[PDB]
Enzyme design. Sequence first.
Site: not given
Length: 310
Positions: A146-147, A160, A142
């Site tokens: 954002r991560n 994450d 993932d």
Amino acid sequence: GEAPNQALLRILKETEFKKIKVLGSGAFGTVYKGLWIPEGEKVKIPVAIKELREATSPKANKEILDEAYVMASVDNPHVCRLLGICLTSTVQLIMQLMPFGSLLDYVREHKDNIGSQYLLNWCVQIAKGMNYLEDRRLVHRDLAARNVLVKTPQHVKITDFGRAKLLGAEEKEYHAEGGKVPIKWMALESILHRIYTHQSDVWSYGVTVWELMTFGSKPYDGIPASEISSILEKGERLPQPPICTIDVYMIMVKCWMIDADSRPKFRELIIEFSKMARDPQRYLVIQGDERMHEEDMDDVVDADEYLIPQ
Ligand SMILES: COc1cc(N2CCN(C)CC2)c([N+](=O)[O-])cc1Nc1ncc(Cl)c(Nc2ccccc2P(C)(C)=O)n1
């Protein structure tokens, strides 16, 4: 044995730390900005406390202790480390506070200040991160802007691991039965056959670099994930961002080859961006690049990454 994970798992006391503000909440739960003060030790360490939810069964299949498991193992300058765990009903994952937020947010806020030296270096740092995970036979599953978290503007970390899956000695791929999924970041091979390799991670690294060079756009914006599979199949890809030479673009595009043995390896990705980050502007044409490079109560006796080397 096939690498006895002799890592350590630290257990902490919800008493020896104090929450201070909610940083966010999704279905998973809440992460708080926090302060950890180990007893005795004259240190105060800024932390994030990640609290989640329970269920009628999902709370007791390793709600997160899976994540606490993978993060308990990883040690690397460009990967979030789990400081420790907290055994309250809703077990808390204690983590180093990334005091500048997610990168996705960051690049938006600061577009007209981000330089090319910066962009290229986050590119180099994330590949270094991912290459560690490939070393440890880990598949992030993932990776996205954002991560990726921001400790300083000159230091980022992959962040994450809810979906991280460790491969076993004879496993070249993983096969995630299902759940929801971040469609616009996943290798076509994944979007059709639930197959994830380190090389599908490279596809994600590609969208991540793209997110970075568009100063934070949304990939396939407008388009619904419903048909990402379809446009991708006929041959479409994400556009070339205006700041990108052929050199940077030809890289992202290689991460999006349909044959995944034909995409770059992280080890190579860092060699390449490394090279670009010495002459950053042969490669990133940024208008005016040239003129471009908490709420602390009482601190004093504080530390951070430097305690984790306890
Ligand atoms: C400076 O404090 C932060 C603020 C902000 N936001 C919100 C407030 N304002 C808008 C500014 C932007 C963020 N964030 O997410 O953008 C991060 C940090 N620091 C931090 N350190 C360690 C961790 Cl583990 C962690 N996780 C975290 C925090 C919130 C949301 C989702 C996560 P995640 C998916 C990776 O679990 N966040």
